[PDB]
Amino acid sequence: PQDLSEALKEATKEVHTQAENAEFMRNFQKGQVTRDGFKLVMASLYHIYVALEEEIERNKESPVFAPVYFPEELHRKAALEQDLAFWYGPRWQEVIPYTPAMQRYVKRLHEVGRTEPELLVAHAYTRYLGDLSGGQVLKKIAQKALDLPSSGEGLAFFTFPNIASATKFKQLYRSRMNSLEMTPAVRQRVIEEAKTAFLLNIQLFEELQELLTH
């Protein structure tokens, strides 16, 4: 529709179905998921979010992003650090993978943050509102298909403790998104960038699939 929040949802309907159709992701939704494959996505998420949250800090005051700056409600680096400590041990930082597909997603993220600020909301949107909704889905699936120990850790990423109601926060986040002042050209690029974000995730999944199989 007319609101950015709805235009984004509709324009990415197509690429989202492609995400779900990604073999690696398709195999995940069907229960079949290795511990090593889940580690690869947690590692992927760590790099993606480090990059994204760095760029958000750089533009926290920019009028092109300030409205959607919710540091406390959304930060995920810390949670991912906690999980990675569990999945990879105390020396996780020296042993986690950093593949080409991860490097490319990070590269674009930095390009946006440094030279195309007006589009950062596109990536913030794709990730945060996407993980807020999808999270509870993959968490459950993994929770069982993995059989992790009662160590009480490793899945912190899937819970946003500073958000009482996902529905209320989303409503507020969409509201802030819709309050963003942008020209038609900028708006179109924001929508295209959301598509690009999806593509980056799709090829990341493709790469993680060829890795898991060798």
Side-chain angles (χ1 to χ4, degrees):
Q2 180 166 287
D3 287 315
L4 178 56
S5 59
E6 261 193 302
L8 277 175
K9 182 186 299 173
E10 189 186 358
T12 60
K13 177 185 178 185
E14 183 193 63
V15 286
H16 184 285
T17 294
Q18 289 177 50
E20 307 177 61
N21 279 35
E23 168 173 345
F24 168 77
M25 202 48 92
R26 199 168 64 241
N27 299 164
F28 197 117
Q29 306 182 76
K30 300 298 81 180
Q32 34 175 170
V33 61
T34 61
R35 235 157 183 170
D36 296 324
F38 190 75
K39 288 162 82 287
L40 283 175
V41 298
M42 293 306 298
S44 295
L45 293 173
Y46 173 71
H47 294 109
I48 294 166
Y49 271 104
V50 158
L52 177 64
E53 309 199 325
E54 270 186 49
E55 294 313 321
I56 288 173
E57 267 311 298
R58 178 199 312 302
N59 303 92
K60 61 206 276 181
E61 298 194 61
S62 169
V64 308
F65 197 85
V68 296
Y69 181 58
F70 288 96
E72 288 302 298
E73 299 71 30
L74 297 178
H75 79 280
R76 232 79 284 279
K77 188 184 72 177
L80 282 164
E81 276 164 359
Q82 297 284 343
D83 295 336
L84 252 38
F86 168 78
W87 293 106
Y88 286 82
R91 295 198 178 278
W92 60 276
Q93 298 192 72
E94 313 170 61
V95 59
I96 62 177
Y98 186 46
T99 63
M102 293 169 197
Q103 308 166 196
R104 277 186 266 99
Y105 198 160
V106 164
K107 172 174 172 285
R108 181 51 186 162
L109 242 21
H110 285 307
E111 280 168 23
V112 177
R114 305 182 169 195
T115 68
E116 300 181 62
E118 340 69 67
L119 308 183
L120 192 61
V121 267
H123 281 92
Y125 163 71
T126 306
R127 278 263 69 93
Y128 293 122
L129 292 204
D131 291 325
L132 240 186
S133 309
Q136 38 186 296
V137 175
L138 296 307
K139 177 191 176 188
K140 198 71 189 66
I141 290 182
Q143 204 171 306
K144 55 192 68 181
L146 289 169
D147 246 60
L148 60 169
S150 302
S151 59
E153 69 193 312
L155 299 179
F157 172 72
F158 299 94
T159 299
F160 295 73
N162 300 145
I163 291 182
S165 174
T167 305
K168 279 55 177 300
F169 180 74
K170 290 176 64 66
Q171 182 183 305
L172 173 66
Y173 198 79
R174 281 170 182 147
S175 201
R176 289 299 187 79
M177 287 178 80
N178 299 319
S179 76
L180 248 62
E181 228 67 284
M182 46 178 74
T183 61
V186 170
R187 181 167 158 132
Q188 307 186 60
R189 277 195 290 141
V190 170
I191 294 180
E192 297 303 313
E193 200 52 38
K195 293 188 183 300
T196 293
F198 271 85
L199 298 188
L200 286 169
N201 278 277
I202 288 179
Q203 54 192 58
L204 163 61
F205 297 150
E206 265 148 46
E207 183 198 68
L208 298 182
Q209 182 55 52
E210 299 190 66
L211 289 168
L212 294 180
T213 64
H214 246 182

PDB file of all heavy atoms in Angstrom, residues 109-139:
ATOM      1  N   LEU A 109      26.266  -4.240   3.890  1.00  0.00           N
ATOM      2  CA  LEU A 109      25.825  -3.595   5.114  1.00  0.00           C
ATOM      3  C   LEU A 109      26.668  -2.350   5.398  1.00  0.00           C
ATOM      4  O   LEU A 109      26.135  -1.293   5.746  1.00  0.00           O
ATOM      5  CB  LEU A 109      25.945  -4.583   6.272  1.00  0.00           C
ATOM      6  CG  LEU A 109      24.700  -5.012   7.052  1.00  0.00           C
ATOM      7  CD1 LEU A 109      23.441  -4.792   6.257  1.00  0.00           C
ATOM      8  CD2 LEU A 109      24.849  -6.476   7.443  1.00  0.00           C
ATOM      9  N   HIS A 110      27.982  -2.480   5.248  1.00  0.00           N
ATOM     10  CA  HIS A 110      28.873  -1.360   5.497  1.00  0.00           C
ATOM     11  C   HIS A 110      28.750  -0.329   4.385  1.00  0.00           C
ATOM     12  O   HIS A 110      28.843   0.869   4.629  1.00  0.00           O
ATOM     13  CB  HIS A 110      30.321  -1.842   5.644  1.00  0.00           C
ATOM     14  CG  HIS A 110      30.599  -2.512   6.955  1.00  0.00           C
ATOM     15  ND1 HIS A 110      30.311  -1.919   8.163  1.00  0.00           N
ATOM     16  CD2 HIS A 110      31.135  -3.719   7.250  1.00  0.00           C
ATOM     17  CE1 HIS A 110      30.653  -2.732   9.149  1.00  0.00           C
ATOM     18  NE2 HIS A 110      31.156  -3.831   8.620  1.00  0.00           N
ATOM     19  N   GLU A 111      28.532  -0.788   3.162  1.00  0.00           N
ATOM     20  CA  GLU A 111      28.359   0.151   2.066  1.00  0.00           C
ATOM     21  C   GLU A 111      27.148   1.042   2.367  1.00  0.00           C
ATOM     22  O   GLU A 111      27.218   2.265   2.231  1.00  0.00           O
ATOM     23  CB  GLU A 111      28.124  -0.598   0.760  1.00  0.00           C
ATOM     24  CG  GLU A 111      29.385  -1.132   0.127  1.00  0.00           C
ATOM     25  CD  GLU A 111      29.086  -2.096  -0.992  1.00  0.00           C
ATOM     26  OE1 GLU A 111      27.967  -2.029  -1.561  1.00  0.00           O
ATOM     27  OE2 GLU A 111      29.975  -2.912  -1.311  1.00  0.00           O
ATOM     28  N   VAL A 112      26.046   0.417   2.783  1.00  0.00           N
ATOM     29  CA  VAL A 112      24.824   1.148   3.089  1.00  0.00           C
ATOM     30  C   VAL A 112      25.035   2.148   4.216  1.00  0.00           C
ATOM     31  O   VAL A 112      24.715   3.328   4.081  1.00  0.00           O
ATOM     32  CB  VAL A 112      23.679   0.183   3.479  1.00  0.00           C
ATOM     33  CG1 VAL A 112      22.430   0.967   3.854  1.00  0.00           C
ATOM     34  CG2 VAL A 112      23.382  -0.763   2.316  1.00  0.00           C
ATOM     35  N   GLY A 113      25.581   1.667   5.325  1.00  0.00           N
ATOM     36  CA  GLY A 113      25.822   2.517   6.470  1.00  0.00           C
ATOM     37  C   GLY A 113      26.718   3.715   6.198  1.00  0.00           C
ATOM     38  O   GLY A 113      26.487   4.800   6.743  1.00  0.00           O
ATOM     39  N   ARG A 114      27.719   3.536   5.342  1.00  0.00           N
ATOM     40  CA  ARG A 114      28.658   4.609   5.043  1.00  0.00           C
ATOM     41  C   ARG A 114      28.358   5.508   3.845  1.00  0.00           C
ATOM     42  O   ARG A 114      28.672   6.697   3.873  1.00  0.00           O
ATOM     43  CB  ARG A 114      30.063   4.022   4.887  1.00  0.00           C
ATOM     44  CG  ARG A 114      30.483   3.203   6.099  1.00  0.00           C
ATOM     45  CD  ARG A 114      31.883   2.673   5.970  1.00  0.00           C
ATOM     46  NE  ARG A 114      32.347   2.117   7.240  1.00  0.00           N
ATOM     47  CZ  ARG A 114      33.619   1.843   7.517  1.00  0.00           C
ATOM     48  NH1 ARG A 114      34.564   2.071   6.614  1.00  0.00           N
ATOM     49  NH2 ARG A 114      33.948   1.346   8.702  1.00  0.00           N
ATOM     50  N   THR A 115      27.753   4.964   2.798  1.00  0.00           N
ATOM     51  CA  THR A 115      27.486   5.779   1.620  1.00  0.00           C
ATOM     52  C   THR A 115      26.031   5.856   1.169  1.00  0.00           C
ATOM     53  O   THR A 115      25.706   6.676   0.313  1.00  0.00           O
ATOM     54  CB  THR A 115      28.315   5.292   0.440  1.00  0.00           C
ATOM     55  OG1 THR A 115      27.835   4.001   0.035  1.00  0.00           O
ATOM     56  CG2 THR A 115      29.803   5.195   0.839  1.00  0.00           C
ATOM     57  N   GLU A 116      25.164   5.010   1.718  1.00  0.00           N
ATOM     58  CA  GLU A 116      23.747   5.028   1.350  1.00  0.00           C
ATOM     59  C   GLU A 116      22.879   4.918   2.618  1.00  0.00           C
ATOM     60  O   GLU A 116      22.024   4.045   2.735  1.00  0.00           O
ATOM     61  CB  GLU A 116      23.443   3.873   0.379  1.00  0.00           C
ATOM     62  CG  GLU A 116      24.251   3.930  -0.920  1.00  0.00           C
ATOM     63  CD  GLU A 116      23.920   2.807  -1.884  1.00  0.00           C
ATOM     64  OE1 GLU A 116      22.756   2.729  -2.324  1.00  0.00           O
ATOM     65  OE2 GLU A 116      24.822   2.001  -2.212  1.00  0.00           O
ATOM     66  N   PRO A 117      23.081   5.837   3.575  1.00  0.00           N
ATOM     67  CA  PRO A 117      22.315   5.811   4.823  1.00  0.00           C
ATOM     68  C   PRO A 117      20.809   5.663   4.649  1.00  0.00           C
ATOM     69  O   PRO A 117      20.193   4.857   5.338  1.00  0.00           O
ATOM     70  CB  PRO A 117      22.695   7.134   5.496  1.00  0.00           C
ATOM     71  CG  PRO A 117      24.038   7.441   4.948  1.00  0.00           C
ATOM     72  CD  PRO A 117      23.915   7.052   3.496  1.00  0.00           C
ATOM     73  N   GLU A 118      20.223   6.432   3.729  1.00  0.00           N
ATOM     74  CA  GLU A 118      18.764   6.391   3.484  1.00  0.00           C
ATOM     75  C   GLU A 118      18.183   4.990   3.308  1.00  0.00           C
ATOM     76  O   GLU A 118      16.965   4.812   3.390  1.00  0.00           O
ATOM     77  CB  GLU A 118      18.369   7.188   2.227  1.00  0.00           C
ATOM     78  CG  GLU A 118      19.361   8.227   1.755  1.00  0.00           C
ATOM     79  CD  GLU A 118      20.622   7.619   1.196  1.00  0.00           C
ATOM     80  OE1 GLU A 118      20.555   6.965   0.132  1.00  0.00           O
ATOM     81  OE2 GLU A 118      21.681   7.803   1.828  1.00  0.00           O
ATOM     82  N   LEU A 119      19.043   4.006   3.045  1.00  0.00           N
ATOM     83  CA  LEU A 119      18.576   2.637   2.830  1.00  0.00           C
ATOM     84  C   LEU A 119      18.772   1.708   4.014  1.00  0.00           C
ATOM     85  O   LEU A 119      18.296   0.576   3.997  1.00  0.00           O
ATOM     86  CB  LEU A 119      19.280   2.023   1.621  1.00  0.00           C
ATOM     87  CG  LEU A 119      19.264   2.803   0.308  1.00  0.00           C
ATOM     88  CD1 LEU A 119      19.951   1.970  -0.764  1.00  0.00           C
ATOM     89  CD2 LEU A 119      17.833   3.120  -0.087  1.00  0.00           C
ATOM     90  N   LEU A 120      19.483   2.165   5.039  1.00  0.00           N
ATOM     91  CA  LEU A 120      19.713   1.317   6.197  1.00  0.00           C
ATOM     92  C   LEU A 120      18.423   0.753   6.820  1.00  0.00           C
ATOM     93  O   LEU A 120      18.428  -0.371   7.330  1.00  0.00           O
ATOM     94  CB  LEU A 120      20.528   2.060   7.263  1.00  0.00           C
ATOM     95  CG  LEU A 120      21.022   1.103   8.352  1.00  0.00           C
ATOM     96  CD1 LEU A 120      21.941   0.052   7.709  1.00  0.00           C
ATOM     97  CD2 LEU A 120      21.745   1.875   9.448  1.00  0.00           C
ATOM     98  N   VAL A 121      17.329   1.517   6.793  1.00  0.00           N
ATOM     99  CA  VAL A 121      16.072   1.015   7.346  1.00  0.00           C
ATOM    100  C   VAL A 121      15.661  -0.260   6.637  1.00  0.00           C
ATOM    101  O   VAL A 121      15.035  -1.131   7.238  1.00  0.00           O
ATOM    102  CB  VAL A 121      14.885   2.006   7.199  1.00  0.00           C
ATOM    103  CG1 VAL A 121      14.777   2.859   8.444  1.00  0.00           C
ATOM    104  CG2 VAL A 121      15.065   2.880   5.952  1.00  0.00           C
ATOM    105  N   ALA A 122      16.014  -0.373   5.362  1.00  0.00           N
ATOM    106  CA  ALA A 122      15.650  -1.555   4.599  1.00  0.00           C
ATOM    107  C   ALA A 122      16.265  -2.806   5.218  1.00  0.00           C
ATOM    108  O   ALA A 122      15.614  -3.847   5.311  1.00  0.00           O
ATOM    109  CB  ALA A 122      16.086  -1.404   3.133  1.00  0.00           C
ATOM    110  N   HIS A 123      17.520  -2.708   5.639  1.00  0.00           N
ATOM    111  CA  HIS A 123      18.184  -3.850   6.256  1.00  0.00           C
ATOM    112  C   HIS A 123      17.749  -4.069   7.703  1.00  0.00           C
ATOM    113  O   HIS A 123      17.658  -5.212   8.171  1.00  0.00           O
ATOM    114  CB  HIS A 123      19.704  -3.689   6.176  1.00  0.00           C
ATOM    115  CG  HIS A 123      20.267  -4.031   4.831  1.00  0.00           C
ATOM    116  ND1 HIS A 123      20.450  -3.093   3.836  1.00  0.00           N
ATOM    117  CD2 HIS A 123      20.659  -5.215   4.309  1.00  0.00           C
ATOM    118  CE1 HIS A 123      20.934  -3.685   2.761  1.00  0.00           C
ATOM    119  NE2 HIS A 123      21.069  -4.972   3.022  1.00  0.00           N
ATOM    120  N   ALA A 124      17.480  -2.973   8.403  1.00  0.00           N
ATOM    121  CA  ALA A 124      17.023  -3.031   9.785  1.00  0.00           C
ATOM    122  C   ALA A 124      15.663  -3.716   9.807  1.00  0.00           C
ATOM    123  O   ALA A 124      15.381  -4.561  10.648  1.00  0.00           O
ATOM    124  CB  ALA A 124      16.897  -1.621  10.343  1.00  0.00           C
ATOM    125  N   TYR A 125      14.826  -3.320   8.857  1.00  0.00           N
ATOM    126  CA  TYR A 125      13.489  -3.861   8.702  1.00  0.00           C
ATOM    127  C   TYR A 125      13.541  -5.370   8.433  1.00  0.00           C
ATOM    128  O   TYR A 125      12.933  -6.176   9.142  1.00  0.00           O
ATOM    129  CB  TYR A 125      12.807  -3.165   7.523  1.00  0.00           C
ATOM    130  CG  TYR A 125      11.597  -3.899   7.020  1.00  0.00           C
ATOM    131  CD1 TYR A 125      10.427  -3.951   7.773  1.00  0.00           C
ATOM    132  CD2 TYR A 125      11.638  -4.587   5.811  1.00  0.00           C
ATOM    133  CE1 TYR A 125       9.325  -4.676   7.331  1.00  0.00           C
ATOM    134  CE2 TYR A 125      10.546  -5.310   5.361  1.00  0.00           C
ATOM    135  CZ  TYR A 125       9.392  -5.350   6.124  1.00  0.00           C
ATOM    136  OH  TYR A 125       8.306  -6.048   5.651  1.00  0.00           O
ATOM    137  N   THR A 126      14.276  -5.727   7.390  1.00  0.00           N
ATOM    138  CA  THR A 126      14.431  -7.108   6.967  1.00  0.00           C
ATOM    139  C   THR A 126      14.860  -8.027   8.110  1.00  0.00           C
ATOM    140  O   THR A 126      14.274  -9.090   8.323  1.00  0.00           O
ATOM    141  CB  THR A 126      15.462  -7.177   5.843  1.00  0.00           C
ATOM    142  OG1 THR A 126      15.072  -6.275   4.797  1.00  0.00           O
ATOM    143  CG2 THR A 126      15.544  -8.571   5.280  1.00  0.00           C
ATOM    144  N   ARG A 127      15.884  -7.598   8.842  1.00  0.00           N
ATOM    145  CA  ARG A 127      16.409  -8.367   9.954  1.00  0.00           C
ATOM    146  C   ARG A 127      15.532  -8.351  11.215  1.00  0.00           C
ATOM    147  O   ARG A 127      14.958  -9.372  11.572  1.00  0.00           O
ATOM    148  CB  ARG A 127      17.821  -7.876  10.290  1.00  0.00           C
ATOM    149  CG  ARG A 127      18.903  -8.465   9.411  1.00  0.00           C
ATOM    150  CD  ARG A 127      19.568  -9.650  10.087  1.00  0.00           C
ATOM    151  NE  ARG A 127      18.708 -10.828  10.205  1.00  0.00           N
ATOM    152  CZ  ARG A 127      18.659 -11.820   9.320  1.00  0.00           C
ATOM    153  NH1 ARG A 127      19.419 -11.787   8.230  1.00  0.00           N
ATOM    154  NH2 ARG A 127      17.867 -12.864   9.541  1.00  0.00           N
ATOM    155  N   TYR A 128      15.414  -7.196  11.871  1.00  0.00           N
ATOM    156  CA  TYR A 128      14.635  -7.103  13.107  1.00  0.00           C
ATOM    157  C   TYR A 128      13.176  -7.548  13.020  1.00  0.00           C
ATOM    158  O   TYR A 128      12.767  -8.444  13.756  1.00  0.00           O
ATOM    159  CB  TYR A 128      14.725  -5.688  13.692  1.00  0.00           C
ATOM    160  CG  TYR A 128      16.114  -5.326  14.183  1.00  0.00           C
ATOM    161  CD1 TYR A 128      16.796  -4.222  13.669  1.00  0.00           C
ATOM    162  CD2 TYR A 128      16.767  -6.118  15.130  1.00  0.00           C
ATOM    163  CE1 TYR A 128      18.099  -3.920  14.079  1.00  0.00           C
ATOM    164  CE2 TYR A 128      18.071  -5.821  15.552  1.00  0.00           C
ATOM    165  CZ  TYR A 128      18.729  -4.723  15.019  1.00  0.00           C
ATOM    166  OH  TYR A 128      20.025  -4.441  15.420  1.00  0.00           O
ATOM    167  N   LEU A 129      12.388  -6.944  12.134  1.00  0.00           N
ATOM    168  CA  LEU A 129      10.987  -7.346  12.032  1.00  0.00           C
ATOM    169  C   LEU A 129      10.867  -8.760  11.502  1.00  0.00           C
ATOM    170  O   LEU A 129       9.874  -9.436  11.748  1.00  0.00           O
ATOM    171  CB  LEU A 129      10.183  -6.383  11.149  1.00  0.00           C
ATOM    172  CG  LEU A 129       9.968  -4.963  11.696  1.00  0.00           C
ATOM    173  CD1 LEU A 129       8.733  -4.345  11.059  1.00  0.00           C
ATOM    174  CD2 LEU A 129       9.783  -5.004  13.203  1.00  0.00           C
ATOM    175  N   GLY A 130      11.882  -9.213  10.778  1.00  0.00           N
ATOM    176  CA  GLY A 130      11.857 -10.562  10.255  1.00  0.00           C
ATOM    177  C   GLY A 130      12.177 -11.574  11.348  1.00  0.00           C
ATOM    178  O   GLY A 130      11.493 -12.592  11.487  1.00  0.00           O
ATOM    179  N   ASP A 131      13.215 -11.299  12.134  1.00  0.00           N
ATOM    180  CA  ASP A 131      13.600 -12.211  13.202  1.00  0.00           C
ATOM    181  C   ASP A 131      12.631 -12.185  14.378  1.00  0.00           C
ATOM    182  O   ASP A 131      12.528 -13.149  15.127  1.00  0.00           O
ATOM    183  CB  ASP A 131      15.026 -11.914  13.679  1.00  0.00           C
ATOM    184  CG  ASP A 131      16.074 -12.275  12.638  1.00  0.00           C
ATOM    185  OD1 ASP A 131      15.887 -13.277  11.916  1.00  0.00           O
ATOM    186  OD2 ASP A 131      17.093 -11.572  12.545  1.00  0.00           O
ATOM    187  N   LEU A 132      11.912 -11.080  14.534  1.00  0.00           N
ATOM    188  CA  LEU A 132      10.944 -10.973  15.616  1.00  0.00           C
ATOM    189  C   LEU A 132       9.799 -11.945  15.333  1.00  0.00           C
ATOM    190  O   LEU A 132       9.288 -12.598  16.241  1.00  0.00           O
ATOM    191  CB  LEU A 132      10.393  -9.543  15.717  1.00  0.00           C
ATOM    192  CG  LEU A 132      10.606  -8.760  17.017  1.00  0.00           C
ATOM    193  CD1 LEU A 132       9.859  -7.442  16.925  1.00  0.00           C
ATOM    194  CD2 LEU A 132      10.107  -9.546  18.211  1.00  0.00           C
ATOM    195  N   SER A 133       9.416 -12.040  14.061  1.00  0.00           N
ATOM    196  CA  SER A 133       8.334 -12.921  13.628  1.00  0.00           C
ATOM    197  C   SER A 133       8.801 -14.367  13.451  1.00  0.00           C
ATOM    198  O   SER A 133       8.240 -15.289  14.043  1.00  0.00           O
ATOM    199  CB  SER A 133       7.761 -12.425  12.302  1.00  0.00           C
ATOM    200  OG  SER A 133       7.436 -11.048  12.361  1.00  0.00           O
ATOM    201  N   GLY A 134       9.832 -14.555  12.631  1.00  0.00           N
ATOM    202  CA  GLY A 134      10.351 -15.888  12.370  1.00  0.00           C
ATOM    203  C   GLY A 134      11.017 -16.591  13.539  1.00  0.00           C
ATOM    204  O   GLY A 134      10.887 -17.804  13.692  1.00  0.00           O
ATOM    205  N   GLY A 135      11.735 -15.830  14.359  1.00  0.00           N
ATOM    206  CA  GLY A 135      12.418 -16.398  15.508  1.00  0.00           C
ATOM    207  C   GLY A 135      11.691 -17.532  16.215  1.00  0.00           C
ATOM    208  O   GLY A 135      12.114 -18.683  16.145  1.00  0.00           O
ATOM    209  N   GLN A 136      10.599 -17.210  16.898  1.00  0.00           N
ATOM    210  CA  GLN A 136       9.827 -18.213  17.625  1.00  0.00           C
ATOM    211  C   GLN A 136       9.536 -19.474  16.807  1.00  0.00           C
ATOM    212  O   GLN A 136       9.198 -20.517  17.364  1.00  0.00           O
ATOM    213  CB  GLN A 136       8.520 -17.590  18.138  1.00  0.00           C
ATOM    214  CG  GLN A 136       7.873 -16.611  17.171  1.00  0.00           C
ATOM    215  CD  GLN A 136       6.675 -15.904  17.775  1.00  0.00           C
ATOM    216  OE1 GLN A 136       5.671 -16.532  18.112  1.00  0.00           O
ATOM    217  NE2 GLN A 136       6.778 -14.586  17.918  1.00  0.00           N
ATOM    218  N   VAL A 137       9.679 -19.378  15.487  1.00  0.00           N
ATOM    219  CA  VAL A 137       9.438 -20.518  14.607  1.00  0.00           C
ATOM    220  C   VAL A 137      10.640 -21.455  14.589  1.00  0.00           C
ATOM    221  O   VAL A 137      10.520 -22.643  14.889  1.00  0.00           O
ATOM    222  CB  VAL A 137       9.157 -20.059  13.155  1.00  0.00           C
ATOM    223  CG1 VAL A 137       9.037 -21.271  12.238  1.00  0.00           C
ATOM    224  CG2 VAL A 137       7.883 -19.225  13.107  1.00  0.00           C
ATOM    225  N   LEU A 138      11.798 -20.909  14.227  1.00  0.00           N
ATOM    226  CA  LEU A 138      13.031 -21.683  14.154  1.00  0.00           C
ATOM    227  C   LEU A 138      13.496 -22.161  15.524  1.00  0.00           C
ATOM    228  O   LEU A 138      14.076 -23.241  15.645  1.00  0.00           O
ATOM    229  CB  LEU A 138      14.143 -20.857  13.498  1.00  0.00           C
ATOM    230  CG  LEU A 138      13.953 -20.446  12.033  1.00  0.00           C
ATOM    231  CD1 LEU A 138      13.632 -21.680  11.191  1.00  0.00           C
ATOM    232  CD2 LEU A 138      12.837 -19.416  11.916  1.00  0.00           C
ATOM    233  N   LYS A 139      13.247 -21.357  16.553  1.00  0.00           N
ATOM    234  CA  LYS A 139      13.642 -21.717  17.906  1.00  0.00           C
ATOM    235  C   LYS A 139      13.023 -23.052  18.272  1.00  0.00           C
ATOM    236  O   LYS A 139      13.720 -23.988  18.651  1.00  0.00           O
ATOM    237  CB  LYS A 139      13.174 -20.660  18.901  1.00  0.00           C
ATOM    238  CG  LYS A 139      13.496 -21.001  20.342  1.00  0.00           C
ATOM    239  CD  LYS A 139      12.776 -20.062  21.284  1.00  0.00           C
ATOM    240  CE  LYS A 139      13.013 -20.440  22.732  1.00  0.00           C
ATOM    241  NZ  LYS A 139      12.151 -19.616  23.621  1.00  0.00           N
TER     242      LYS A 139
END
